[PDB]
């Protein structure tokens, strides 16, 4: 599953 646009911010 690819990650949402903001996952990386957490």
């Amino acid at each position: 599953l690819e990650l949402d646009k903001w996952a990386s911010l957490w």
Partner: antibody
Amino acid sequence: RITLKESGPPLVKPTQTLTLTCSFSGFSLSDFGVGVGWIRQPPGKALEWLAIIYSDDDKRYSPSLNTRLTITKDTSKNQVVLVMTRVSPVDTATYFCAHRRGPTARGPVNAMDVWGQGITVTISS
Amino acid sequence: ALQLTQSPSSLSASVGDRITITCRASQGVTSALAWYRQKPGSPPQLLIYDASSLESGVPSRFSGSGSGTEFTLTISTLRPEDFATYYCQQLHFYPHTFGGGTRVDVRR
């Protein structure tokens, strides 16, 4: 403040193409990270995620409907457009477009905060 | 696909009851889970964003908790405006999945 509204044909014919527009105000697609998504709901069924498009034009579609959906945005008009091809009676539902907050204050992107009335589309020959 | 299971799918309660409902995710979605209340004929209305944060303008009776795979929505005291269908949505993975919904009706 932020309001969204869906527009298009309430009656579409099987195989024909469905074009929907989301007109909004109270926010612009030039605001960092802002998104606008499409969610549909068949009569008496659960919500179904369709697609999302952001300020930078980043797009994502539901894998299952990917070869049938195309999402675009026109900043000059504050409108987002969804085009669904070869529709069938099963695509009969209410379509909603919603606003998604961008990073300011992080967690508030984890949701679609403002939705449009939704538009009822019926697929019949 | 990431499966979101809502429990219970259907529920009967009375005004003044305290109900809690859950939404299970097949994979961890961290805190990226939202809750909505949808009344018949009306669009979904955000209650909780980021799993535990009360959305501005929403009654204090609503609350949310959880992280990873387990999440709950609690209504300290149920009002008439609360007999509707509830949905959870994870926005951690694409696609953004919605649960099947929890229907809350009046008990008799």
